């Protein structure tokens, strides 16, 4: 076929392909998300639709169980292709095994592609990072993050896409426990670090949660709208 | 048409003492109505502390005893110590079944000393089943042998009469007798009976021949 | 200037094995000892966010009910190559009713350490600390991306390598016991480590001939970091 | 240096770098020692170790109950030619149900590592072979390199700075074919203490002895028993 | 083989002192009808060893061709070793196993008589695999009709001389002429010693028919 | 047989510019009918037919499969396609399977595209074609429509003495059959329309 | 620059610049001669000692490929016994399948395919050996052969193979052919060998001669080079 | 063997892919298409590239192909190369139809193409398909659709789209002149004359040099109207009085 | 050969013969029929002795493979479920296999049947073997789900006494484990004749 490697390992010692694939991630679409103890949430910024056209076709958000949920960032295209193994993967599992799917076995399905995809021959590495939100049984939320390399990795709220170091920092003045107290709060929580994120008009602002006993829900956005309005309230209240 | 087996026959015994293993088989290879020679010992060495015993059809018995010694071979170059008697018993297994869909037409009996130095005889059937025995007869003279081994040895069927453990000339005695008396009935088994003695200490061997019918 | 990825050197050695263990060096340092008692073991996380969730980073995983584990630098990398491991030690005690021996079952990993090619790709970039009781009373293994693989009685991997092997050899004879040994790494770990050592850093690995299986729960950890 | 990226490319001098340079790789090994009698065949190696508390690398290992190996280089190829040595004795042992004569298994060596000297994106093996065996017209001590260019010898040496045993064992070659095992093993460890500086030697502790003999099985050795071995020395001079 | 087409008939092979003799007819059949009188079924291999066969003669065509392309090669090889009879034995017993395992059988019955290193060698090769080694061997209705003269005179003295040997066979073979439909009057006896392999012609029998004048 | 699994019956019958096809309704395994709405004629384009007789899984599946190469060939041609071209088409996917050959006995009948020219034709399980210009028949009940054709026949038909001829060799040699009954369906095509009758059959 | 790389480029004059150099890599191997007589093929092969280096007997350069048929090979090495393996796979499919000995001709055709074939890619280099190829039959005479890294294979009288080559040469066509029986050519090959190739870079050498014709009944094998110890005996009366 | 070897698929280190961005500029040439969808019906335009006077015509199609009975597709970029894909395309439609006897709704049919472009730009070093293409169709469960392929494999659907580097100022033209689902079959024609009258600089838009193909709903035939000519020149005449009346305003 | 297996209140009951027979003629008298797979599992031995043995072994690779994957012992139906699958791809070349599968579970008591046909269904009372029917009738009599501990291991013992005394190839030791909550845990071994002394008076 292509007998080639294509990722050599560097003379300092480094992957340049896992390590500048992280690039294309750095310049996609910004995405976060939380959890909070029973109702879990996260949402993508930056559509930058172009405000007069369809959009459900450019959804970020999918799901490939009942129980899981998706995100990611980078190139839309190999997440369409990894999103697509994923759904295969998990309905091969319910085939099997009479459980719902464990959101930690589908997050090292993915993470374990990736790496025997950056290591075969002639294949260039995935340039994506998802988000894989689920609560499996006795209603545990639990979030983690991709990468690149391969390496699943839980987390508590997401820093992923353009900028994402700003973001965090937001989170990190902003770990209260108090904000995960009110699923309503944990809602505003997401709305206001990804208003201290892009433009947040209001219209990129593409959310979607679950409450752990049902399915994924997209909220429509005038909701949003009265959720950053008394956002902005309280930022009046503030003063 | 073209018949794939054919019964060669030979009879194996095995007692499993309190420190020794005794395997003793007859020599003769036969053929329906003929003999072929009256000399082919059906036990094998493997190990300082194993020996093997292979009846029925003689190719598959050849072939057998060959592989098992490569796979020894293999796991000596690979673990820097022999095998076990129950590691050779699941390979055995493992082997017969890997030939499951055109079989074996192969009995086997395993004998020799465990790691605590006590006897253990692993019995076998063509398809690949095992078990812990202390005692089994395999071959054409299996049912002229296990009923007078569940006598002596087992025990078994008797009023007041005590268990003694086996000793071993008493054992000595015992293949000698169970020889003589299934070779007065039996066609296939030989003259000379070839008696290997598995001790802590090597391997011994012994010849007795039998009447030359 | 771009050569075929399997071209020795000049010198002598290769290239892109040697680019690997350049590559171990960025990793996340680890630390085990060898004890009669039996085998200790130790590792530090790297914790870096505070987002970041604490117990899900592995470092210390599981090969066997007796034959331990800690990785190095990449992880997923690691992550193949002890999934594969597991599966030949459990083809062995299935086809052998026994328990591959520790060595054995390095043998069988750099087996294929370098069976890096383009037909029949690059090489493996992790090193590995293998322990666990055999017959052989308790090991202590080493391996390397260039499958050169050796016994240490007390080896130290990765970034702080150099003066954890030097102040390991300051500490270290034949007759330890084991919480001796613990102590004494985690004194090695927190001279080498650059946050402060608390319940969340670092995570140890013991197995014993008498304590029969590596278990470590949390909060003992507490109990031997608060023995300082 | 546009000549000396691969395997396939002739030099213009018409030498295949790459061949040189898996020699080189060859030359950076530990040193080691084989030697024969007429009867008795000796192979002597020396072990180093990566740290003090780590333990030594071995070098003898077994092949077959009359064939035994040393090796220098790398160690993957070296088990994978290993792995392949022992499949080929074992076949043969299988099949024809006799030992193999030392000479037909070297030429299958030599004729394994000649394809990944002559395609394109394969290494040569990285290899420092040197063999003793027993077929029936007695001791061979064989010895390979990279190129696949094997040689039957009566004494050679390979490794770092293995050329001051070849000097001991010229002086001695004569001496070599008539003795018995215990003062041939020590003339291959006198190659060993001038293969080294002249103030650490062979404290038990990094040192290997296979012998093969006519009744005696191959055989490795290892400080403990290798402690009856070591006396019956004096010292280096002044 | 599936069916076998044109056969031979009965071999015959026996030690003596120093050497193993063994004597094969020179018939090929078909059927009833004897339609080779005139073929060889011994082959002379190298030095040591030496091969005779029944059964389909195609077949030992084959292995005749197989095995001289195997002593070739290690003639070839120069080093001064060569294939011990036993280790022949041993191949062939492979070669009969591995036909019959994927139930493509070779249709024969060869014996396989050597001498090297002051011992002498009579190897048994079946069809099935079924192999040994024994001081008489007998193929065919061999087995049934010279056989017990063969243990007749080994039992009562287990050593022979050559030319012992040599009168046994022919008395065999005259036997084997007497009570087989399916034999020939016209034998070659091949004969290993020291001296190498030697391969007498087609000698012939001196038959009785007293028994005729009896009504 | 197998051919007499589940029954059936297609007659084909050439007119003067016009051409009626027609085949039975009853659907059931060997003596045990199950439904009386089987299809076993398809459209195939415009003004041109095909039926299908025999064991009814081979009639479903070689129906979606002419179907499949049928709609690639006129997408990859814009013109539709000729009868001789699907009668080899058929032809050939039927001699695929040489030796995994389906029990199915297709018969075509259809207009010309170009001119009102009619055509018939059949086939046998492995591909042989069969051009007449009277009628061809497919199924178990073959003898009785054989009696009926050659007993009725006409060469110059109008379209109703047409439809009443085949409509009363359908119902006389389907009457006489056993395994094949339960109601007809009727296709009678012309140039300018397509027309489909449904009679009133024994339902015994 | 640019066009010595690859075995599959040409050049801007017209010629591979591999095969050159690959032709140029037999060039520095040791002189290894043959000639034949009227009826049989004597080989020769220049063996040299350095120090001590080996035992007397190891990598015999004189192959021997079928009864018939060997090999005076030189260049480099292990390519030369692949080579060798090859052409004994050879004999091997020509005598299972047609049942006689394979005639030289054929032989040398196969073989001088494969070395072509290994020339014409990328992926493979080609051959750094050049060999001679003897051998002798009732029905042919004697046919002596020689095949270059190239692949042009066509027959001699006499030829040489390696460092003098020329120089071996000169006193190859000083000899004929109609008048020789082997065995005076076994003791003239001999003479000369010690002849070329003075003592200067290398000290001390060692021969070897291979002998194939109607004496040896159409067999090829070694010279009982020990038994008449023809070189020598007129090797040393050969410096004046 | 090495040196030869181009690397089409590996990353720039500027930080985006290299030979995708260059077929995409290979995409900006050579073409111009947009269509209409809003309301009961969907439209195509298209440009001749060939619009030389020695020409046939007799190929009853052009740009569009119609790839299934409710589905076409303008063709941008290399021509051949699509039509490799249209085979490929019509055939898994035709595939899906002969699994499950329901016609192929409109997005699985644009991800098995995408996942095709995708499959030939992660793993190789082969060429990358340099073709966008446009998509009408109808289905069961969402009316009249317009989506819009990439080299790449990303899709996204569109009510009114562009390819051809000519028409990023259609796109703009577009937004100015949106509406709210108001087609009307005349109204969208007009703007789509009005559009491809402004963008191309073709001066006064040669009716022979353009392309209109509709889709309309009707119960059993789902009618594909690739119309005439005449028809296209009285709308040219239609909108060249509505700019004369336009004008009135100065 | 006859097992019996039946869940109830406290966890599960295994019971077993350990006659094996070749034809007409016994081989042993002690084959343990229930084959340990786990800590946490039984299978049993259901005709085919090689084939039991051998796919059960393959079944609890399987499963230690799935513990050290997901840090989680493995579910029954999940177990049964490998096993199923494993076996359905060698039907009709001649398999005999009819073992049961019993565990501890997240919901509890676990009791399934597997067959060489392939047949995969729960339930609470099983019987497999040559004469298992004489333990179904039995069995079916003394059933119920609100039994003590003593009352179910003598149904258990006293039903496989039934089944050896009416059938021929039913015989030898009647085996006896218990399948808790934690772990299983064997009971007792006892001999046929010693039960005939007990239950014939």
């Given at each position: 076929?292509?007998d080639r490697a294509?990722?050599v ?231 | ?213 | 200037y771009d050569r075929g990825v399997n071209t020795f050197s000049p010198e002598g050695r290769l290239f892109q ?99 890096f090619g383009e037909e029949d ?108 | 240096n546009q000549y000396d990226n691969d395997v396939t490319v002739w030099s213009p001098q018409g030498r295949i770098h790459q061949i040189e340079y898996a020699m080189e790789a060859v030359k950076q ?44 280089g790398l160690?993957?190829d070296?088990?994978?030619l ?25 030429s299958?060596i030599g004729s394994k590592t000649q394809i990944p000297t002559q395609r394109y994106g394969r290494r040569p093996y990285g290899v420092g ?14 010895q390979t390199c990279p190129s696949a260019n094997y040689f ?6 390979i ?80 | ?215 | ?204 | 620059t640019g066009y010595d790389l690859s075995a599959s480029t040409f050049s801007p004059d017209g010629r591979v610049f591999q095969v050159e150099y690959a032709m140029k890599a037999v060039e520095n191997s040791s002189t290894a001669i043959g ?10 092969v220049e063996k040299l000692?350095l ?8 990598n015999?350069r004189?192959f021997?490929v ?5 090999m005076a090979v030189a260049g480099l090495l292990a390519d030369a016994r692949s080579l060798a393996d090859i052409a004994?796979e050879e ?17 040398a055709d196969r073989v001088a395919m494969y070395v072509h074939a290994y020339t014409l890619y990328s992926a493979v280099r080609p051959f750094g050996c050049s060999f001679m190829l ?11 052969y020689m095949i270059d890294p190239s692949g042009v294979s066509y027959?001699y009288?006499?030829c040489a193979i390696g460092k003098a080559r020329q120089a071996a040469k ?27 190739h003075?003592?200067?870079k290398d ?38 | 063997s090495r040196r030869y070897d181009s ?244 | ?201």
């Open positions: 076929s292509y294509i990722t390992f560097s003379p300092d010692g480094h992957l340049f392909q896992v390590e500048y694939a992280q690039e294309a991630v750095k310049k996609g679409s910004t995405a976060v998300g939380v959890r909070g103890r029973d109702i879990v949430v996260l949402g993508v910024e930056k559509k930058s639709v172009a405000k007069l056209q369809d959009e459900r076709t450019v959804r970020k958000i999918c799901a490939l169980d009942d129980n899981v949920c998706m995100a990611f960032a980078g190139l839309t295209a190999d997440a369409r292709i990894v999103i697509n193994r994923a759904r295969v993967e998990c309905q091969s599992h319910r085939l099997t095994v009479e459980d719902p799917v464990t959101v930690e076995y589908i997050t090292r399905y993915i993470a374990s592609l990736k790496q025997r995809y950056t290591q075969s021959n002639g294949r260039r590495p995935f340039g994506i990072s998802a988000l894989i939100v689920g609560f499996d049984f006795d209603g545990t939320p639990r979030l983690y993050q991709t990468d690149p390399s391969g390496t699943y990795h839980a987390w508590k709220a997401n820093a992923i896409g353009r900028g994402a170091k700003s973001v965090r920092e937001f989170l990190e003045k902003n770990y209260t426990d108090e904000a995960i107290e009110t699923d309503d709060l944990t809602i505003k929580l997401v709305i206001k670090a990804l208003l201290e994120v892009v433009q947040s008009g209001g219209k990129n602002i593409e959310l979607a949660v679950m409450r752990r006993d049902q399915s994924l829900k997209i909220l429509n956005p005038e909701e949003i709208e009265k959720y950053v309005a008394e956002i902005e309230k309280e930022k009046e209240e503030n003063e | 048409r073209f018949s794939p087996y054919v019964f060669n026959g030979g009879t194996i015994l095995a007692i499993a003492g309190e420190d020794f293993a005794i395997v003793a088989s007859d020599t003769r290879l036969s053929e329906g109505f003929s003999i072929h020679t009256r000399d082919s010992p059906k036990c094998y060495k493997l190990t300082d502390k194993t020996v093997i015993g292979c009846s029925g059809f003689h190719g598959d018995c050849l072939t057998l005893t060959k592989i098992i010694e490569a796979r020894l071979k293999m796991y000596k170059h690979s673990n820097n110590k022999a095998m076990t008697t129950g590691a050779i018993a699941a390979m055995l297994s493992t082997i017969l079944y890997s030939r499951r869909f055109f079989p074996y037409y192969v009995y086997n009996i395993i004998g020799g000393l465990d790691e605590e130095g006590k006897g253990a005889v692993y019995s076998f059937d063509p398809v690949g089943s095992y078990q812990r025995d202390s005692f089994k007869a395999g071959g054409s003279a299996s049912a002229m042998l296990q009923p007078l081994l569940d006598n002596q040895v087992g025990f078994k069927n008797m009023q007041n009469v005590e268990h003694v453990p086996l000793s071993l000339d008493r054992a000595m005695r015992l293949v000698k007798d169970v020889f003589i008396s299934a070779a007065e009935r039996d066609v296939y088994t030989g003259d000379a009976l070839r008696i290997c003695i598995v001790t802590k200490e090597g391997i011994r061997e012994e010849t007795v021949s039998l009447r030359k019918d | 094995v040697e680019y690997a263990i350049e590559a171990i060096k960025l990793g996340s340092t680890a630390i085990g000892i060898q004890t009669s008692e039996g085998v200790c073991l130790a590792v530090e996380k790297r914790i870096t966010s505070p987002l970041m969730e604490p117990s899900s980073i592995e470092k210390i995983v599981e090969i066997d009910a007796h034959i331990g584990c800690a990785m190095s630098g990449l992880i997923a990398d690691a992550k193949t190559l002890i999934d594969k491991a597991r599966v030949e030690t459990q083809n062995h005690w299935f086809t052998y009713n026994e328990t591959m021996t520790v060595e054995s079952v390095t043998q069988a990993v750099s087996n294929l350490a370098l069976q790709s690059r090489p493996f970039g992790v090193a590995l600390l293998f322990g666990g009781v055999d017959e052989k009373g308790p090991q202590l293994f080493h391996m390397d991306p260039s499958g050169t693989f050796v016994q240490c009685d007390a080896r130290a991997i990765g970034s702080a390598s150099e003066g954890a092997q030097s102040s390991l050899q300051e500490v270290y004879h034949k007759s330890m016991t084991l919480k001796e040994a613990i102590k004494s790494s985690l004194i090695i770990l927190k001279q080498v480590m650059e946050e402060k050592l608390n319940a969340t850093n670092i995570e140890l690995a013991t197995v014993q001939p008498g304590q029969n299986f590596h278990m470590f729960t949390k909060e003992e950890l507490e109990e031997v970091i608060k023995d300082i | 090994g530990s040193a080691t020692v084989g030697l024969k009698s007429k009867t008795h065949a000796v192979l002597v190696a020396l072990k180093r170790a990566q740290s003090e508390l780590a333990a030594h690398q071995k070098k003898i290992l077994h092949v077959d109950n009359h064939i035994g190996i040393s090796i220098a160690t993957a070296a088990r994978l290993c792995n392949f040595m022992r499949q080929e004795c074992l076949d043969s042992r299988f099949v024809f149900d006799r030992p193999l004569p030392v000479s037909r298994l070297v299958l072979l040197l063999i003793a065996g027993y077929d029936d017209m007695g001791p061979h001590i064989f039957d010898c009566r004494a050679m040496s490794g770092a700075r293995s050329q001051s045993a070849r000097t001991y064992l010229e002086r001695h070659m004569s001496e070599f074919m008539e003795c018995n095992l215990n003062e041939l093993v020590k003339h291959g460890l006198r190659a060993l203490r001038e293969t080294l500086p002249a103030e650490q030697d062979l404290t038990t502790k990094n040192v290997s002895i296979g012998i093969v003999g006519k009744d005696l099985e191959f055989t490795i050795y290892d400080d403990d028993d290798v402690s009856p071995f070591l006396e019956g020395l004096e010292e280096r001079p002044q | 083989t599936q069916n076998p087409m044109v056969t031979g008939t009965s071999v015959l092979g026996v030690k003596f002192e120093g050497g193993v003799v063994i004597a094969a007819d020179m018939l090929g059949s078909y059927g009833s009808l004897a339609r080779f009188r005139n073929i060889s079924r011994i082959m002379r291999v190298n030095n040591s060893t030496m091969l005779g066969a029944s059964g389909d003669y195609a077949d030992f065509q084959y292995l005749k061709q197989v095995l001289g392309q195997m002593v070739i090669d290690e003639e070839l090889l120069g080093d001064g070793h060569s294939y011990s009879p036993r280790a022949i034995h041993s191949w062939l017993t492979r070669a009969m196993y591995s036909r019959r395992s994927k139930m493509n059988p070779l249709w024969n019955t060869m014996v396989i008589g050597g001498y090297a290193d002051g011992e002498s060698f009579l190897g048994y090769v079946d069809m099935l695999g079924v192999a040994y080694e024994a001081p008489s061997l007998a193929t065919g209705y061999g087995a049934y009709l010279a056989q017990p003269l063969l243990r007749e005179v080994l039992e009562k003295q287990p050593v022979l001389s050559q030319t012992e040997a040599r009168d046994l066979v022919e008395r065999c073979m005259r036997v084997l002429y007497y009570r087989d439909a399916r034999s020939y009057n016209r034998f070659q006896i091949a004969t290993v010693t020291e001296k190498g392999v030697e391969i007498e012609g087609p000698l012939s029998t001196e038959t009785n028919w007293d028994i005729a004048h009896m009504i | 047989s197998i051919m007499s699994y589940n029954g059936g019956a297609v007659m084909a019958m050439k007119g003067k510019n016009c051409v009626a096809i027609a085949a039975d309704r009853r659907f059931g395994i060997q003596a045990q009918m199950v439904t009386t709405d089987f299809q076993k004629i398809f459209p195939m384009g415009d003004r041109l037919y095909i039926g299908l007789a025999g064991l009814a899984t081979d009639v479903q599946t070689v129906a979606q499969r002419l179907k499949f190469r049928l709609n690639l060939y006129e997408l990859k041609e814009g013109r539709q396609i000729k009868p001789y071209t699907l009668m080899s088409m058929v032809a050939n996917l039927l001699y695929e399977k040489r030796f995994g050959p389906y029990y199915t006995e297709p018969v075509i009948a259809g207009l010309d595209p170009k001119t009102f020219k009619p055509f018939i034709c059949s086939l046998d399980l492995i591909g042989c074609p069969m051009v007449t210009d009277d009628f061809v028949v497919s199924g178990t009940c073959a003898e009785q429509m054989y009696g009926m054709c050659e007993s009725l026949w006409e060469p110059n038909m109008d379209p109703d003495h047409l439809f009443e001829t085949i409509s009363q060799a359908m119902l006389n040699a389907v009457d006489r059959d056993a395994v094949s009954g339960m109601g007809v369906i009727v296709h009678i095509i012309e140039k300018d329309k397509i027309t489909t009758r449904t009679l009133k059959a024994r339902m015994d | 000639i034949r007589c009227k009826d049989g093929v004597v080989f020769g000692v120090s001590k280096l080996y035992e007397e007997g190891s015999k004189l021997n079928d009864r018939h048929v060997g004994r004999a091997s499919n020509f005598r299972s399948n047609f049942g006689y000995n394979i005639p030289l001709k054929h032989l003897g051998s002798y039959s009732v029905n042919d005479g004697a046919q002596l027959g009288w006499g000169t006193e190859i066509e000083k000899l004929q052919m109609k008048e020789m029986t082997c065995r005076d050519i076994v003791k003239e090959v001999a003479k000369i060998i010690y002849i070329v003075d003592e200067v000290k001390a050498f060692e021969l070897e001669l291979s002998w194939v014709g109607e004496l040896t009944n159409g067999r090829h094998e070694i010279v009982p080079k020990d038994i008449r110890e023809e070189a020598e005996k007129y090797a040393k009366e050969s410096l004046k | 690397r089409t698929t590996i990353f720039s280190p500027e930080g985006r892919l290299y030979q995708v961005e260059y077929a995409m500029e290979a995409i900006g040439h050579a073409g111009t298409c947009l269509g209409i969808l809003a309301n009961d019906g969907v439209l195509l335009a298209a440009e001749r590239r060939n619009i030389h006077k020695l020409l046939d015509e007799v190929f009853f199609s052009e740009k569009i192909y119609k790839l299934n009975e409710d589905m076409a597709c303008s063709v941008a970029g290399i021509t051949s190369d699509a039509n490799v894909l249209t085979n490929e395309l019509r055939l898994i439609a035709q595939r899906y139809l002969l699994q499950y006897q329901e016609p192929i709704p409109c997005e699985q049919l644009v991800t098995a193409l995408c996942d095709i472009k995708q499959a030939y730009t992660q793993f190789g070093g082969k060429r990358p398909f340099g073709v966008s293409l446009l998509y009408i169709g109808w289905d069961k469960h969402y009316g009249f659709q317009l989506y819009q392929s990439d080299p790449s494999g990303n899709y996204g659907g569109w009510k009114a789209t562009c390819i051809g580097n000519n028409s990023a100022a259609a796109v703009s033209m577009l937004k100015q002149d949106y509406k709210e689902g108001e087609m009307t079959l005349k109204s969208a024609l007009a703007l789509a004359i009005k559009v491809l009258n402004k963008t191309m600089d073709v001066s006064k838009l040669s009716a022979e040099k353009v392309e209109i193909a509709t889709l309309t709903r009707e119960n059993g035939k789902t009618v594909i109207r690739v119309l005439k000519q005449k028809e296209v020149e009285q709308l040219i005449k239609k909108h060249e009085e509505e700019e004369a009346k336009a004008e009135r305003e100065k | 050969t006859t097992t019996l297996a039946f869940k109830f209140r406290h966890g599960v009951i295994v019971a077993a013969d350990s006659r094996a027979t070749a034809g007409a003629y016994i081989a042993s008298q002690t084959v343990k029929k229930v084959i340990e797979i786990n800590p946490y599992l039984l299978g049993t031995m259901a005709g085919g002795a090689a084939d039991c043995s051998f796919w059960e072994r393959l079944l609890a690779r399987q499963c230690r493979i799935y513990e050290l994957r997901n840090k989680e012992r493995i579910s029954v139906a999940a177990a049964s479920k490998l096993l199923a699958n494993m076996v359905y791809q060698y039907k009709g070349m001649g398999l005999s296999m009819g073992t049961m599968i019993c565990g501890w579970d997240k919901r509890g008591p676990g009791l399934y049947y597997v067959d060489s046909e392939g047949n995969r269904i729960s339930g609470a009372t099983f019987s497999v073997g040559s004469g298992s029917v004489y333990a179904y009738g039995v069995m079916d009599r003394g059933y119920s789900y609100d039994l003590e501990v003593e009352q179910a291991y003598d149904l258990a013992r006293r039903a496989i006494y039934q089944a050896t005394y009416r059938d021929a190839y039913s015989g030898g030791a009647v085996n006896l484990y218990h399948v808790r909550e934690d772990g299983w845990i064997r009971v007792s071994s006892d001999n046929v004749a010693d039960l005939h002394e007990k239950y014939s008076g």
